[PDB]
Amino acid sequence: KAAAIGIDLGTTYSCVGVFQHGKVEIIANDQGNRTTPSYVAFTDTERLIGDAAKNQVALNPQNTVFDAKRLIGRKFGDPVVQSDMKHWPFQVINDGDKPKVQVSYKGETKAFYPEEISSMVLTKMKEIAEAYLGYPVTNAVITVPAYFNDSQRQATKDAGVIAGLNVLRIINEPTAAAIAYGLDRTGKGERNVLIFDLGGGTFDVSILTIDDGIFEVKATAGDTHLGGEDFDNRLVNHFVEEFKRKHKKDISQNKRAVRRLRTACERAKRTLSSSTQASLEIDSLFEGIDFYTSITRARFEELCSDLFRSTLEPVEKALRDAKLDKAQIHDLVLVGGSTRIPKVQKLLQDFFNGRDLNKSINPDEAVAYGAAVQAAILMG
Ligand SMILES: Nc1ncnc2c1ncn2[C@@H]1O[C@H](COP(=O)(O)OP(=O)(O)NP(=O)(O)O)[C@@H](O)[C@H]1O
Ligand SMILES: [Mg+2]
């Protein structure tokens, strides 16, 4: 009766969809955004989630949590966890070999499991859907990277249950993307599908073989630390140098200034996917000095040229592992907000000798879209 929802719980942005009245609808949140930051923040008086949390990140770096997906289902001693901890502004502690994020909340020290943090993000996605539908949601399909192990899948499901959702199924993100494009339905025989997923924090390449609605992972490649945030970083360093040239001041030490500049760069970056230039206007960036400038799409491409180019190596590697030539791939599917960058689409298309790309569904919404279709199917 009530519709089930599909939820892409991303490392950096999450998205929710619902199949209703013959179509999938990706649901906009309170601020009108089709995707919501996977951020949670704790203050002296409240818990903020999504846009409201990410928006005050510069003001409260120690108690604003993100990247919970990097910790979920892992052991404190996991080398990945130990490595990732070096770069986060928030504290992570060991609780029975399970990591917990420790923060200050309402004047006290409190710690939360990764699934608790993600349950908050999922709760927000559930509320977003309920606001649109006009009624409560209690069924959902949630997605995870194809390489997640049983523990990571269990903890992701636990996050959903904590959020008040009955988790119909946990399915792989690349499978969800294929379902969004109706690729789960094939003619006689098997089809080889390549999912090129470049998001905010990670880059995943997956080669799937689909046969009669059955999905098999033939190969996976990528880089868990390559994504849109790295492109934002190249822009930040470029503007830090511009500010030095213009004002003979180095703002790299001011945390607030660098965070505000990063936020502005992410917006300018998005604009450069549709327009050829973008302007950045930051009032009182550093020592009361305003910073108003512009940057062109070509300059952005130059600043990230090596990073963009590097995305084709995992594609080559995945093909090698799957024992397939480029011509044997039947469909190319774009996933992740970073694949909206024209240069990235050109590199992939050129690498595949001119093949058209499946890109009619916003890339950062494709996983949630498929998850919603799967959820509707499962509800019968
Ligand atoms: N129009 C755009 N042009 C370029 N980049 C964009 C655009 N829209 C969103 N992005 C970036 O896409 C990234 C988010 O991708 P998205 O797929 O929504 O996140 P995700 O699912 O969490 N992926 P991941 O971080 O790897 O788990 C961020 O770096 C956004 O800044
Ligand atoms: Mg996402």
Q: Does the annotation list 200 as a binding residue?
A: yes
CB 24 within 8 A of CB 159: no
The CATH architecture of the domain made up of 186-227+311-358 is: 2-Layer Sandwich (3.30)
Name the nearest CA neighbour of 330 among 181, 143, 112, 170: 181
Q: Which two tokens stand for residue 118?
A: 């993600």
Residues around ligand 2, an ion, CB closer than 5 A? 8, 10, 13
Q: Whole-angstrom Cα distance, residue 202 to residue 292? A: 31
CA 76 / ligand 2 centre spacing (Å): 25
Three-state SS at 22: coil
What is the β-pairing status of strands 289-296 and 277-286?
A: antiparallel
Task: Indicate the resolution in Å.
Answer: 1.8
| Among 36, 40, 61, residue whose Cα is nearest residue 113 | 40
Rounded Cα distance between 301 and 42, Å, is: 37
Rounded Cα distance between 92 and 34, Å, is 30
> Can you tell me the distance from the alpha carbon of 300 to that of 257, in angstroms, rounded to the nearest whole number?
21
CATH topology of domain 66-120: Defensin A-like (3.30.30)
Q: How many CB atoms within 10 Å of residue 338?
A: 29
Question: 297, 290 in Cβ contact below 8 A?
Answer: no
Question: How many Cβ atoms are within 10 Å of 45's Cβ, its own excluded?
Answer: 8
Q: Hey, what amino acid is at 280?
A: L
271 is in an annotated binding site: yes
Q: Are strands 139-144 and 5-8 parallel, antiparallel or unpaired?
A: parallel
Place of tokens 């030095």: 244
The single-letter code of the amino acid at 74 is R
Domain map (residue ranges) of the chain: 1-65+121-185+359-379, 66-120, 186-227+311-358, 228-310
User: 């604009």: which residue's tokens?
Assistant: 271
* Strand ordering across the sheet containing 98-105: 91-95, 98-105, 108-112
Question: DSSP assignment of 38-98, as one string?
Answer: --EEE-SS-EEETHHHHHTGGG-GGGEE--GGGTTT--TT-HHHHHHHTT-SSEEEEETTE
Bridge partner residues of 205 (DSSP): 196, 221
The domains spanning 1-65+121-185+359-379 and 186-227+311-358 adopt the same CATH topology: yes
CA 350 to chain CA centroid, Å, is 25
**199 CB under 6 A from ligand 1?**
yes
| CA 144–ligand 2 middle distance (angstroms) | 10
Instruction: Please tell me whether 11 is known to bind a ligand.
Output: yes
Would the CB of 35 count as within 6 Å of ligand 1? Answer: yes
User: φ, ψ for residue 47 (rounded to 5)?
Assistant: -115, 130
CB 181 within 8 A of CB 175: no
DSSP strand pairing (139-144 vs 166-172): parallel
Both tokens assigned to 45 = 């008086």
Starting from the CA of residue 270, give the closest ligand: 1
Method: X-ray
Q: Would you give the distance in Å from CA 86 to the centre of its chain?
A: 21
List of E strands, the chain: 5-8, 13-20, 23-26, 36-37, 40-42, 47-49, 64-65, 91-95, 98-105, 108-112, 139-144, 166-172, 191-198, 203-211, 214-223, 277-286, 289-296, 331-335
Residue type, 376: A
Concatenating the DSSP letter of every residue in 352-374 gives TTT---B-SS-TTTHHHHHHHHH
Q: Round to the nearest angstrom and report the end-to-end CA distance of the chain.
A: 10
Mutation choice for ligand 1 from 205, 270, 369, CB with most ligand atoms inside 8 A: 270
For the domain made up of 1-65+121-185+359-379, give the CATH fold: Nucleotidyltransferase; domain 5 (3.30.420)
37 alpha carbon – ligand 1 mean position (Å):
10
DSSP 8-state code for residue 337? G
Q: Which residues pair with 8 in a beta bridge?
A: 15
Secondary structure letter of residue 106 according to DSSP: T
Which residues make beta-bridge pairs with 102?
91, 111
**Most distant CA pair in the chain: distance in Å?**
67
Q: How far is the C-alpha of 187 from the C-alpha of 203, rounded, in Å?
A: 30
Given a contact cutoff of 8 angstroms between Cβ atoms, the answer to whether 291 and 285 are in contact is yes
Domain boundaries 228-310, corresponding CATH code: 3.90.640.10
